[PDB]
Ligand binder design. Sequence first.
Ligand code: ANP
Ligand code: ANP
Ligand code: MG
Ligand code: MG
Lengths: 606, 606
Amino acid sequence: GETFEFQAEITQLMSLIINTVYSNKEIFLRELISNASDALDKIRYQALSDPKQLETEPDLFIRITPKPEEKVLEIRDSGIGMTKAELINNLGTIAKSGTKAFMEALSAGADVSMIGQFGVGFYSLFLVADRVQVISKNNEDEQYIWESNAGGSFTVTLDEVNERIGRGTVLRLFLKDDQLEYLEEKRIKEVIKRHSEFVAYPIQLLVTVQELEELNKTKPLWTRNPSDITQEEYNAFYKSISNDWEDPLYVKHFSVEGQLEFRAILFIPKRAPFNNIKLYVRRVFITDEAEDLIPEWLSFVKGVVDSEDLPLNLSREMLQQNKIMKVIRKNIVKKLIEAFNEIAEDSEQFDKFYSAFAKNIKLGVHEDTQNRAALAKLLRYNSTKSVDELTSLTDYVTRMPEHQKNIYYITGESLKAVEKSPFLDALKAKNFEVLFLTDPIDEYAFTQLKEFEGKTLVDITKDFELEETDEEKAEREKEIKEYEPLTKALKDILGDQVEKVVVSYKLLDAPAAIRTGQFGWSANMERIMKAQALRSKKTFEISPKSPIIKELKKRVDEGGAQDKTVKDLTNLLFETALLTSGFSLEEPTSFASRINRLISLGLNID
Amino acid sequence: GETFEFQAEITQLMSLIINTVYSNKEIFLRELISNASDALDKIRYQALSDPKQLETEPDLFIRITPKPEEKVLEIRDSGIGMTKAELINNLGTIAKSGTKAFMEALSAGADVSMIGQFGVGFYSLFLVADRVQVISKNNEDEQYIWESNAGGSFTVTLDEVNERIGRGTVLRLFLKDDQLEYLEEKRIKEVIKRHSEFVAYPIQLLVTVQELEELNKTKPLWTRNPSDITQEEYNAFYKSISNDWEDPLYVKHFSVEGQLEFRAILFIPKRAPFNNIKLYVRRVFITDEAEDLIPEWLSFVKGVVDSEDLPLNLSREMLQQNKIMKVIRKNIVKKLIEAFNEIAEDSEQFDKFYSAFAKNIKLGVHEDTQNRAALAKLLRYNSTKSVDELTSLTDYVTRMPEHQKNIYYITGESLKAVEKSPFLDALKAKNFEVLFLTDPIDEYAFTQLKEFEGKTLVDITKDFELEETDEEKAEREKEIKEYEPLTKALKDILGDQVEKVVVSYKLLDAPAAIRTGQFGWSANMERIMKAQALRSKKTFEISPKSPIIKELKKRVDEGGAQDKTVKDLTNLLFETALLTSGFSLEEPTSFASRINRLISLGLNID
Ligand SMILES: Nc1ncnc2c1ncn2[C@@H]1O[C@H](COP(=O)(O)OP(=O)(O)NP(=O)(O)O)[C@@H](O)[C@H]1O
Ligand SMILES: Nc1ncnc2c1ncn2[C@@H]1O[C@H](COP(=O)(O)OP(=O)(O)NP(=O)(O)O)[C@@H](O)[C@H]1O
Ligand SMILES: [Mg+2]
Ligand SMILES: [Mg+2]
């Protein structure tokens, strides 16, 4: 049948590209600098084969001159420029990107990496300007003026009233009556620092005597190998990408080659606030709101990532959904894990790294599952054998005897409450080391690990059993069977406050304590859960080697299982053991009342 | 001078709209259903003036008949259809939207609201298909076939081998090999539920026996009159917009007819979800990730918002930054405040609502400032006179005596620990009501309020002054200096644990108590801060009329300022006051050992 070619309504496509493509109206400056950088890259590539191309204009720069008295923001560069034909075919045709044609026409293997590849970015200037007066000048042509008012047609006339420029393009922007904000120095500097910070060419800005100030003093470091970059340059780079005042603690500069090519310079700060990783394609900032490239627990680091094969959208403000995001996320996680392992080789630097980002590492163990074993070796806690220095789990399993098959730890509110806990005497009598956990997020990660190099993590606050000789077990069972009336009477006294009352030999000096029941929340977990602003079973055991329990035993033998004088004593002892174990004290008024009664008894007053 | 018209490269403009824009590949179905809905709206408006237009096909529907045998996802509708000239200019031209041409040619007082306003949405089908065969049929022309290969030209041939449809368009989408996922019923139903759920015209889908199933069974309610909607319809609408299984508690259906006309049906769930509010433009879901649309503390509210004059971008997945979302946020906040006030008029309804979203309201008092006084009326807490039922702040200040100027409250870990706290007897003697704060987020709101109807919020756990008579102030000053040597000796024993020790008359039944101070954190605030997963000063007081303090007074009169038996009592009583006030002990081992010493002394243990 009949065949027709596709057409495009210019009077509607122009408004479609200008108004309904870009969300913000400040990226017009970023696109103009990107076009100027592409022109300078073209004239530089032409200068490598012919040095006479820079005789007219030797300096390569981009000059921006705001004029509030004339309502014009001029954009002047010293690039290759546009001839009479380029002002019609390249600049006058929508979706025509001559920068793409220049990139595909050069010989394979060039070092240049230009930015423009769509062909409609130049029309973004009309979002803040009504009429434009772009002036071009090429070495192989005269000086012309490209005038437009975002209408249906454009006018190109020979320049005979303006100054004779050497080489480059002068983009005269007549701003609208409601877009005068872009004539201020602070607004221009903010747009540059946000979108046009790491351009390879100097961005000169005319500020008020008139002077020129460069807005891109900091050069990108991802274009150089990590072998010839000093630490001060890394500190300046970190202070430039972020508003932080302190130098980065550690820098990780890697480069992945092969099917995916991308470079990233990830920095580790010196403090924690309790996204951050910027994305750069063709030396231009695209977006920083992609949460899928970096995990939430790992979002404490700062830095930028440079790439060239990312499928950028038309607006150049973000990227499409692709499978490369998972690849770059895995690479960043692996490189940061390697960086953490390198920091672990040092003692002074890793101390600051752990004291500043312990929560992030412990979160990495809690949520993440693939790198859980790698992050478990970075945990540092105190123990009975290490009171001052922090000891890892790798050094913990080395000091474990041949008969110990489990890793013992303990949680609590503070370090002073767990260092003198009544659950440590039994483990120290057997020369068993017990770790110390003082942060509320420690148990959230220890409940996910449940194993380290084959050693099961056992919490001493919960119920647990220890191996012993058959003779000791036979003697302990014959002692437990005779304390049975005491535990039975004490259970009836406590009522439903505890699950059961059994004799425990894991207490030497403490008279009694309350443990957990191997399941549910522990003594510290329920305290953390009942204290969150945005958001189990207990067992009472006594020690048969304490004089207090020995005196309580002879009370039920004479018929004192239901006396009124003993009830006050056993209830107060239960609430005291409840406090020393880490549980929540319900109704402290009766506790204080009984305490005051003993005070009166000790002060000889009734 | 030389004037030239703007041009557009077809081979590049097409590629611009095939990879850059429409970052998601599943929205091709949404756009095609929107085009079918526009065609049906056209034929429905044409039927209002000529009923004979629907004689060829009376039914109005969109049929989705997948065919995995030949890898085609054909979409058939019964809209107005396109003629021979419409398949060239309306469909074959980029950025040409005949739907906009039909909208601008509408009569005065039209009611139809069509979706098509750009003209590039039809070309989104090439994201998953390599070639299309659009079969159109209009009442004023013959049945033609519009074929394309996503290249630079298209072919239009007269239909001779396909079905002789009555009226509408048939779009044969030959899906690519890597995009065969859209041939299953699950993917089609998910895309329809995500974007094309609330289309006014029925969407038919062939599920393979060949049977048809309507996907858009839930009709929208924002177009109908809110006063005519029943509760079951609101429940069914809530079950469709959200995956929740519980019925909505309260529904707020309002419509603002100001400078920006928009409809919104906000629902109140029954459980806290710890975005949620979806945005619709002309019965089309665009996005649900709007930040400025709803505050953070208000994210628990579910519902949808329908607007018409919104700056839709090219991809129709976000709004442009035109500073128009602030008025929508303000209207939503105001309407939900009115909704909460209406819920407060009912007893059982507000009891069910406050029991599920108390933290959300308290967080709203914490961060929000413009509606802080409005949200303060919804705060419900217990008190000494309201131990059973909840009481607001208005009912609290109405029962305040004429000589009370401050609102007294108390915070603690639980309600049983604050109902008998020794800080209540001082206010109970003056017949002053004291609120009970049992949640960790209550102080974060009470610190931001600081006042309610001129009454200053004063925490009784902190240092505060009570009004007294000169006859009582005289005897208080006479007895304060009498106890001064006891306080000096007690401070010398306590050391740096407390700042100062003052004889406070705000204690009647307790021998002593400890407070934080006048400024800074409270007793429970520092405990919550030290118990958070992502994350002081003390003033000691005594009661001069207690037998314990009266006996301790005579101890220092005989030279007992530095005895060995008084320091044990001093430390023990200090930790007891530290317990009853809501703090945490420095070490429970020392407290447990001291209590065990009392037990040995009481049990005559030598
Ligand atoms: N300042 C300039 N100096 C010289 N040539 C320029 C300048 N600005 C634009 N051009 C030319 O005009 C063409 C049109 O560019 P433009 O419409 O901005 O889109 P693009 O830069 O080519 N691709 P993109 O940046 O992704 O939108 C460029 O390819 C250059 O050849
Ligand atoms: N199924 C259809 N039946 C009849 N006419 C149709 C159909 N699909 C598209 N058209 C016509 O083709 C035109 C092109 O529409 P399209 O390219 O999809 O963008 P649009 O819908 O007009 N505007 P937008 O939805 O914002 O992209 C429409 O305006 C209709 O006039
Ligand atoms: Mg450009
Ligand atoms: Mg469309």
